[PDB]
Amino acid sequence: SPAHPSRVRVIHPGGGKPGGPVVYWMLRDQRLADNWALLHAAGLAAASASPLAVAFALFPRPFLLSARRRQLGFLLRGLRRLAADAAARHLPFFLFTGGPAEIPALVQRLGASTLVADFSPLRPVREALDAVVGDLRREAPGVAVHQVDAHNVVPVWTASAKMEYSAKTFRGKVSKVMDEYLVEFPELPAVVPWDREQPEGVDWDALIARVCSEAENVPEIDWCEPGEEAAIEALLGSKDGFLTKRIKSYETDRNDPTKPRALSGLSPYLHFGHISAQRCALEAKKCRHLSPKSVDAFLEELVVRRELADNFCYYQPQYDSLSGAWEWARKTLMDHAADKREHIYTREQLENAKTHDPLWNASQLEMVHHGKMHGFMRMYWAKKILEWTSGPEEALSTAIYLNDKYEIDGRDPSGYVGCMWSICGLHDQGWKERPVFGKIRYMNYAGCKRKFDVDAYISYVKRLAGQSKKRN
Numbered sequence: 001s002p003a004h005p006s007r008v009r010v011i012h013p014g015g016g017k018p019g020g021p022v023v024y025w026m027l028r029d030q031r032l033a034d035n036w037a038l039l040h041a042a043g044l045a046a047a048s049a050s051p052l053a054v055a056f057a058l059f060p061r062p063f064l065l066s067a068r069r070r071q072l073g074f075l076l077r078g079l080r081r082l083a084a085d086a087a088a089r090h091l092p093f094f095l096f097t098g099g100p101a102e103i104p105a106l107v108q109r110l111g112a113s114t115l116v117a118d119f120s121p122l123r124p125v126r127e128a129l130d131a132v133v134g135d136l137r138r139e140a141p142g143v144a145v146h147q148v149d150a151h152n153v154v155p156v157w158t159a160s161a162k163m164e165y166s167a168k169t170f171r172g173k174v175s176k177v178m179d180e181y182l183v184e185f186p187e188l189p190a191v192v193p194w195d196r197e198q199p200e201g202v203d204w205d206a207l208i209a210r211v212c213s214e215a216e217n218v219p220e221i222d223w224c225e226p227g228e229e230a231a232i233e234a235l236l237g238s239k240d241g242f243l244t245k246r247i248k249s250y251e252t253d254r255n256d257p258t259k260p261r262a263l264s265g266l267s268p269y270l271h272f273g274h275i276s277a278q279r280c281a282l283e284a285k286k287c288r289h290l291s292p293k294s295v296d297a298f299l300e301e302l303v304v305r306r307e308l309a310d311n312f313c314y315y316q317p318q319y320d321s322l323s324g325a326w327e328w329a330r331k332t333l334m335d336h337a338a339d340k341r342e343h344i345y346t347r348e349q350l351e352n353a354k355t356h357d358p359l360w361n362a363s364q365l366e367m368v369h370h371g372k373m374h375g376f377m378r379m380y381w382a383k384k385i386l387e388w389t390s391g392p393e394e395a396l397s398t399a400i401y402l403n404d405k406y407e408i409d410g411r412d413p414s415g416y417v418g419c420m421w422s423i424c425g426l427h428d429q430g431w432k433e434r435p436v437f438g439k440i441r442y443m444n445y446a447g448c449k450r451k452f453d454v455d456a457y458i459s460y461v462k463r464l465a466g467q468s469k470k471r472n
């Protein structure tokens with residue numbers, strides 16, 4: 001296939017007889033363009049003179065990692081667009097709302113030769129893949145199952161053979177093979193027309209209303225549209241695309257929460273796979289000569305950091321718990337477990353932004369009402385939760401709960417890793433020992449005041465919350 005073999009993990013070789021359909025079980029990478037898993041499926045189909053189908057399984061209530069209206073609405077409106085693009089291309093798109101068990105069911109009805117899955121290190125996804133593999137192993141051992149890393153530039157199992165200590169050590173490994181993997185995408189190979197079972201028609205308006213009303217009412221975001229088309233516009237649009245109109249000031253503005261527009265705004269799209277991270281990297285390379293320092297800094301966050309989070313979650317099964325932190329960090333947090341905290345807030349008080357700290361309150365409200373807290377503020381926000389709760393495990397649990405509830409880009413390896421960086425020093429060095437934090441990196445209000453106009457950020461969030469509360 002068009003996919004580099006290192007991107008392809010053959011889970012089960014299969015056998016039986018070729019000529020059977022190839023099915024791409026789409027999960028993490030909700031796009032037709034720049035998708036190695038789809039390209040691999042199409043390549044298998046084309047080579048065996050067999051038809052090609054895409055299937056998507058929505059996890060039913062309580063939904064994947066407790067997705068709320070906000071996240072469900074974005075995913076489904078994105079999939080509605082994708083389904084339309086699929087039909088225009090005569091690529092069959094099967095939508096299953098009962099759960100992943102429908103995937104093996106379909107594979108058997110169609111007499112599929114191969115199932116291709118994409119890759120995520122998150123435990124509920126890995127467990128669902130494993131269960132599907134087991135179902136097929138027992139009922140259709142002739143069916144081949146392949147998994148393709150379509151999300152990372154460098155395949156997760158190839159980038160490193162182990163969980164890496166930090167961005168530095170991870171960069172050392174990936175920079176060596178970056179030229180081999182940061183390459184263009186070919187077009188989908190042509191495949192014979194689909195002549196098998198036809199996907200059932202979806203009433204998307206009915207489905208979206210149903211699913212979202214079954215989930216907690218965290219409101220949909222209104223400031224960007226989901227899907228491939230809107231994602232490419234966010235990256236490359238002539239009017240206000242990131243790489244076209246905003247890349248220049250990135251290295252010097254990305255840490256300034258009073259410059260909301262300096263960030264790429266790509267994480268919503270990258271999380272749902274509406275846009276390929278490799279696509280974003282390729283386009284950045286094409287404009288590096290115009291803004292070398294900023295592009296280099298962008299590529300560091302986009303490739304090294306993001307992929308380091310996949311590395312961690314893939315190799316560390318306890319990626320959302322204190323036990324998953326490094327020994328130095330666990331010990332320093334334990335050493336300071338008995339230190340009296342200056343403030344203790346409950347989860348409810350934090351969630352509703354009822355602390356003595358107006359900067360922290362602002363960061364919480366930005367997440368609640370806007371759905372995307374400024375990247376610099378996420379570090380401050382999570383560190384205060386450590387400072388104002390009874391212990392690091394409770395802090396970690398609360399940060400993750402809030403992040404996953406409110407962020408449009410949440411329920412993501414990078415969310416778990418962000419909280420772990422903040423609270424447990426994951427991928428960080430140690431610093432001067434102090435009460436509560438021990439050697440975990442400390443940040444404070446005074447430190448923020450030196451760097452940027454804190455009152456301006458506070459005012460900006462107040463205005464956002466106001467509009468959001470009125471709209472609600």
Ligand SMILES: Cc1cc2nc3c(=O)[nH]c(=O)nc-3n(C[C@H](O)[C@H](O)[C@H](O)COP(=O)(O)OP(=O)(O)OC[C@H]3O[C@@H](n4cnc5c(N)ncnc54)[C@H](O)[C@@H]3O)c2cc1C
Pocket residue numbers: 254262263264265266267268270271301302303305306307309373374375376378379382403407409410411412414415416417418419421422
């Ligand atoms: C406490 C905490 C929680 C976080 N929760 C999430 C989350 O739920 N989902 C999420 O995607 N990121 C999370 N992050 C990482 C980071 O804050 C966001 O990726 C970033 O703010 C996204 O906005 P952007 O796309 O405009 O960023 P940009 O600065 O434009 O970055 C571009 C891309 O680089 C990647 N990136 C940037 N910073 C990081 C990082 N520290 N770790 C991994 N990748 C990074 C992302 O893919 C991002 O889209 C968290 C960080 C912290 C400290």
